Design a binder for this molecule. Structure first.
Ligand code: A1B7B
Ligand code: A1B7B
Lengths: 306, 306
């Protein structure tokens, strides 16, 4: 029993982190096979960053201008190219610790683990959700750029996020590993703002199921609802719509607990209209939306990796 | 910016996890140098666990009754001894992935990362504290015993916790790596209840400092207090007493923010006497007590390892 915000074990990713330096700018890079991926603004100085012409900056660069360090191993760079907001440095050694991997673009609502790094070294690991406004509520300082987010499926690492920047309310934005931003952000130091965020409904429902599994049942009521009536209430509380796909994905938890998804929605509806009355659910005094249905299953069933 | 419950990178510990099997009982073991450490109740069947005579269970066994697996490979057990509530198996092969390490016995209020494991494989990583009542608020299922808790400082892993059992209300109990239980617990399936828990005051103050560093300053009030007067309020709210050692440990955060420790105590006092009135601090609707002063500085200054 117990329910915690749980990250994937970080070992397979730790063996892929390197330091990439160009001039006086250092950030993190990801070393997979014979390619090092990092944010393209490794080629900027803090003056350039205010308004960079990345193509113009890149023309003036050559292989030897890119210092790549993997622990104390200096890698020889033998090629470079830009792809969207990411640089790809070809190196002359394949990373012997490359795991099975793929690049994925995640959707809002989906969770992943971040391995926050400085100077090519791990600081820590924590779980994040891609918010509906395409930000993440991370913990990042200067130098964290190039840290990655990922999921593990048995032995396979799915990389979904590379860190680029922080937005006004101390939330974070970045790209997939093909260098395309999540959200309408750009890699420039100019005023930008996240849109209105909303609560990830399917996730809150998952977490209510985790609470039931743990014997925290006080919020179960005697009502049911319809998807359409539920969505009316959701939208007035700035919750995402619940779709049939969400219902389908909640099926394992539904079947495990014997609680119809629509009955749980009716319980959530009451919680939204009446508040929590200072009570807690799984230790929290707010409704938690950064656990996916899969996260709850993995945690409650003790799924392992590696 | 941002402030998250951050675990240590787990790669160093992932390389030490093995499975120990005695008869039909399998649990996790930790393989450091030529020794494997695991809960002594690996020598129990489900029937033995009501009131095991560990001496009698052990005295029958020989080296050969212990199966140690790392991946596919069997390690040859060439010695065994029981120390308190842990078994130590000497194997004929030193772990090639052994990190620099020490064993430490932590104090209530100190935090650590747990690498939850099943069948000798990692399931995930999360941060916990040693509660004042010597329990931890974990996430553990059947098969988790032998999972360990740790801190890293630079390249050195300090192991502090090995998982043994779950108490009522879904909280957890275990030993140091010398096999000595934290708190008054015993490794038998018998009526055991944790003492009333209290709130780690010094940690709440650290997190309030974290909040200020991140711009969340609404709770800074217009008062100060004395240690004596504050401690009267803490006692009333089942908070631990704050000592002068705690005030000293908060020195760095105090000096960084220009906010005297006693002024922060006074702000906390107000929070305790008035409640938070639905407000949040760092996204939490409750006062968080599972970040140490060191945790805050580590996170806010981006300390790395490895
Ligand atoms: C990152 O680690 C990087 N640092 C540098 C330093 C140099 Br000289 C070159 C390139 C990079 S990339 C940081 C990470 C962030 C610092 C604080 N917390 C973080 O998550 N990224 C940045 O500094 C990016 C970077 C430049 C500006 N910026 C920002 O994050 C910020 N945002 C914005 O200007 C705005 F769009 F408003 F949101 C900044 C510094 C927080 C004001 C670019 C986006 C390329
Ligand atoms: C652990 O993984 C172990 N499982 C086994 C199985 C066998 Br056949 C032998 C030895 C072990 S050690 C679990 C972990 C816990 C299960 C639920 N969540 C957990 O964290 N440990 C236990 O089963 C321990 C173990 C036996 C009983 N027990 C308990 O955790 C609880 N004991 C209590 O009665 C109490 F005192 F409350 F703490 C139990 C099973 C949850 C009722 C011993 C203490 C040796």
């Amino acid at each position: 029993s117990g329910f915690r915000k749980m990250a994937f074990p970080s070992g397979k990713v730790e063996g892929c982190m390197v330091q990439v330096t160009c001039g006086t700018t250092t950030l993190n890079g990801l070393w997979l096979d014979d390619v090092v991926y990092c944010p393209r603004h490794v080629i900027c100085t803090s003056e350039d960053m205010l308004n960079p012409n990345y193509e113009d900056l890149l023309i003036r660069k050559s292989n030897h201008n890119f210092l790549v360090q993997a622990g104390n191993v200096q890698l020889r760079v033998i090629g470079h190219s830009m792809q969207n907001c990411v640089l790809k440095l070809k190196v002359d050694t394949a990373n012997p610790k490359t795991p099975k991997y793929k690049f994925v673009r995640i959707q809002p609502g989906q969770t992943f683990s971040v391995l926050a790094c400085y100077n090519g070294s791990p600081s820590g690991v924590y779980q994040c959700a891609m918010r509906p406004n395409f930000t993440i509520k991370g913990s990042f300082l200067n130098g964290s750029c190039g840290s990655v987010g990922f999921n593990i499926d048995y032995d396979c690492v799915s990389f979904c996020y590379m860190h680029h920047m922080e937005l006004p309310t101390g939330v974070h934005a970045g790209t997939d590993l093909e260098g395309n931003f999540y959200g309408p952000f750009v890699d420039r130091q100019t005023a930008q703002a996240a849109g209105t965020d909303t609560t990830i409904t399917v996730n809150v429902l998952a977490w209510l199921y985790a609470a039931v599994i743990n014997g925290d049942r006080w919020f179960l009521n005697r009502f049911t609802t319809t998807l359409n009536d539920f969505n009316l209430v959701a939208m007035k509380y700035n919750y995402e719509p619940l779709t049939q796909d969400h219902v389908d994905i909640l099926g394992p938890l539904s079947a495990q607990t014997g609680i119809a998804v629509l009955d749980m929605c009716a319980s959530l509806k009451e919680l939204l209209q009446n508040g929590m009355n200072g009570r807690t659910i799984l230790g929290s005094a707010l409704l938690e939306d950064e656990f996916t249905p899969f996260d709850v299953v993995r945690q409650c069933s003790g799924v392992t990796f590696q």
